Amino acid sequence: MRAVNWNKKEDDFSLMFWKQNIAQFWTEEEIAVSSDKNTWVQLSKEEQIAYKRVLGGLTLLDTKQGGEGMPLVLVHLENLQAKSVLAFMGAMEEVHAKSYSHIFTTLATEEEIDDIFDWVDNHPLLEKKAGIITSYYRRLLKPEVTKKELYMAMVASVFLESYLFYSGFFYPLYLAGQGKLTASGEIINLIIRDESIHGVFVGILAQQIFAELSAEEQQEVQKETQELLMELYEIEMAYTEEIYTSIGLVEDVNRFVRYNANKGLMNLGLEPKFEEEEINPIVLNGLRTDTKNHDFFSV
Amino acid sequence: MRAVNWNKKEDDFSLMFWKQNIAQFWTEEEIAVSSDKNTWVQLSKEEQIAYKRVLGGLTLLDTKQGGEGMPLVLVHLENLQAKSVLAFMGAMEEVHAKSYSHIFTTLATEEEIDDIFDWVDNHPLLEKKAGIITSYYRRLLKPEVTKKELYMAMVASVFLESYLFYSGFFYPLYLAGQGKLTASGEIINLIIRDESIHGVFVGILAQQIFAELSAEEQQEVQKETQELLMELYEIEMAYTEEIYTSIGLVEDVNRFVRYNANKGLMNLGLEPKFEEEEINPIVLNGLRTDTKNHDFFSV
Amino acid sequence: MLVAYDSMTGNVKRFIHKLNMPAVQIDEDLVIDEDFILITYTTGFGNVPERVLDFLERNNEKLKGVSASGNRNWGDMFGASADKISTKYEVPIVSKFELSGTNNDVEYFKERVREI
Amino acid sequence: MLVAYDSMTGNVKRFIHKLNMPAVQIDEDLVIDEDFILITYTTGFGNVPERVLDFLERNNEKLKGVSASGNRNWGDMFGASADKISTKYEVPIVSKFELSGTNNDVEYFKERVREI
Ligand SMILES: Cc1cc2nc3c(=O)[nH]c(=O)nc-3n(C[C@H](O)[C@H](O)[C@H](O)COP(=O)(O)O)c2cc1C
Ligand SMILES: Cc1cc2nc3c(=O)[nH]c(=O)nc-3n(C[C@H](O)[C@H](O)[C@H](O)COP(=O)(O)O)c2cc1C
Ligand SMILES: [Mn+2]
Ligand SMILES: [Mn+2]
Ligand SMILES: [Mn+2]
Ligand SMILES: [Mn+2]
């Protein structure tokens, strides 16, 4: 049986990603969020509800990625160095999911928190959204998988990392771009910094597998990738309609969803499918935070 | 679908282990090992060969634990907080495996390193040792597992964490207890600090499952646990015979193996099966290092 | 002499049953008004469980000695919960043992407490 | 004007093909002795790929401007490989674009290089 040997490269990318993972290491105790209370009480009821609902949705998605996505993909990789990178990315998915609870503890009482999570557990749209992604993962719960099954799991994973998170990331960035809930925004920005490189990495691996597929299987996965993209888009539009109608932001979030869907496609080496539009400038301002500069290796 | 909620305890232990995992975080760049060259050239040929061979064996075991052990157990846990802890432990298994290459780079040329790993890949005793442990893991590659299958995977994992590593850990500790290869010994001590809490954690989880088993299944897993213990002991004695005969340390390592086998049993809540003997005092001295004091949360 | 103890994963509890001495598990309300020996387990980096610390804050007048369960894998932090208690309250360290203890740990303990 | 570029995951390479301009991928030996525009991607924390740095050490006399591909997810570190090159060698930033660029990124670039 093979042991992992880092003195002999298995690929051109894994070492670069391994080191970047660790340079980006962080934990929720580095960011006190209590000072956000001052702006949180200035939001309306409907704004507070949307903020809690999107955080619950993000928690669910990170839960599935750390607990199913990363482990089930990595167990079937033969590249021991890439497997290592995915194991660390999987651990950071759990740091992310836990960091949302750090935010909830400041903004809500414990009875309000239980209500949010009961709402998440029983929401039919989240159940279908998460169900579609994880069905590609659960197909990998068997000893032998085909390269086509593994490719489609990586596509599903890229679509989660680079695309499905962003209908939820939108609102913390929008508020932080206006000077509201900026501590929580700093945590969301650290999460995004991680997910950005997660999506790139899995997309690289998917492109390597795509090249091993037969001409017939390449056409099959190309068709299914386009169908999956559009199936998830239909769900995202219903989701944004439900979350953001009360606060008049639906068209803004939909634009932001298409913008990140295009980035997810490019992570896979594919051409964009949605028209090019400019990122919302307030969201762009919420992406500007000094905490994203922190390199674990310098201090 | 459930998302993980850290504001509501799922058990009495997971939060304590989560925080300890992170407080113990480290990476190989924190320990320069180049100064070990001065003592490495003072070892005989047979001592150098045994040191490289045990490190290769450890690399294989950490490879399987990070890439099969942790992921396959954690995917079937329903406790979302415990699942989180295992995902982080799995990431640290990959930090451990990589740290061995950091050591090899200082002590050996790249052609010597390739020989060690070819030796590891094709060694029949390591193949059987690793094969026995991972057969319990691979049984979990299916959508539905029984509690008996999950219990036995956790037993196999505890036996790896608390017992099978230690025929390899022995020699770096023995040398470092004599002032030889002390930088590499500091890395081995950080690894041991992690594996110590890994074994405790998985043993707690196994004890919770054991209590859910029927009276008949409890008797069945108790018998199979004893057989597995003794089957692995037979293999370890052949392994120590092959590694340590040339340097006259076989009886010392065998004593150390039984001593840690007893700790592994106790991690599972079971009584010791080997006679109580004192730990080798030179090994004990190799366990005394100041770097084990480092808490990520203080600085 | 009374034995007061705390345990999280059962090792100290199982050691207690080897002693055949009167023993009670501590909680936050517990008031001992007789001489006693404390046995504690050791938490990360050689520390004392917070419940033991809070217990001693109210009961340290009757404390006659301390033993600690630990794991020698922790090097110089093996059983160092006893070191901190011993210096903070100026009582002897009775002993240190690993996990549930060996039968030599048991006889050493009993012989040590008769010495006190 | 020549376009010299480097790419790791293909985004800059794909942007190059949109330009319909003469372009060459840099390596460590490459010597350009004509005016050129550099397009680089951005590495962690807003940095310049080491191969681009080594290339510029020998070729900075002919450098007329720099564009950077990046990801706005990096906030103020978006495309900051251009900032470092622009200040180190006192050449203008031609532009910054995300991944493979938009068609507006292409026309902006071409119009910017005609300005130089
Ligand atoms: C998170 C954790 C940290 C530990 N830290 C130490 C330590 O620093 N020093 C030590 O000697 N033992 C340490 N131990 C070992 C425990 O003290 C030992 O297992 C003891 O028997 C536990 O007692 P209990 O089963 O009664 O709870 C640690 C165990 C855990 C789980
Ligand atoms: C590890 C890593 C770190 C990155 N860091 C940054 C960054 O700090 N700033 C930025 O704007 N883009 C950053 N990026 C994004 C890349 O610059 C972007 O994807 C670019 O299009 C890659 O170009 P290429 O495909 O030609 O290699 C990073 C990408 C990776 C993989
Ligand atoms: Mn995440
Ligand atoms: Mn991710
Ligand atoms: Mn390990
Ligand atoms: Mn381990």
Numbering used by the authors:
A (entry chain A), B (entry chain A): 1 to 299
C (entry chain B), D (entry chain B): 1 to 116
Publication excerpt:
Ribonucleotide reductases (RNRs) are essential metalloenzymes that employ sophisticated radical chemistry to reduce the 2′-OH group of ribonucleotides and thereby produce deoxyribonucleotides (dNTPs), the building blocks of DNA. The class Ib R2 subunit (R2b) metal site can bind two manganese ions or two iron ions. In contrast, the di-manganese R2b form cannot react with O2 but requires a superoxide radical (O2•−) provided by NrdI, a flavoprotein which is generally encoded in the same operon as R2b. NrdI binds tightly to R2b in a 1:1 ratio with FMN at the protein–protein interface, forming a dimer of heterodimers.
The crystals for the first dataset were grown under aerobic conditions, yielding bright orange crystals, indicating that NrdI was fully oxidized. In BcR2bMnMn–NrdIox, the isoalloxazine moiety of FMNox is almost planar, with a butterfly bend of 0.2°. An unknown molecule is bound within 5 Å from the reactive C4a of FMN in BcR2bMnMn–NrdIox, which binds O2 to reduce it to O2•−. The molecule is 3-coordinated to Trp74 (NrdI), Ser196 (R2b), and a water (p-ox in Figure 5D, E). The exact nature of the molecule could not be determined and was thus designated as an unknown atom in the final model. The position of the density in BcR2bMnMn–NrdIox is close to the channel entrance on the R2b surface marked by Lys263, Asn267, and Ser196. In BcR2bMnMn–NrdIox, the two metal ions of R2b are refined at full occupancy and the coordination sphere is clearly defined in the electron density map. Mn1 is 4-coordinated by His96, Glu93, Asp62, and Glu195. Mn2 is 5-coordinated by His198, Glu93, Glu195, and Glu161. The protein complex used in the crystallization for the BcR2bMnMn–NrdIox dataset has not undergone any oxidation of the metal site and both manganese ions are in the Mn(II)/Mn(II) oxidation state.
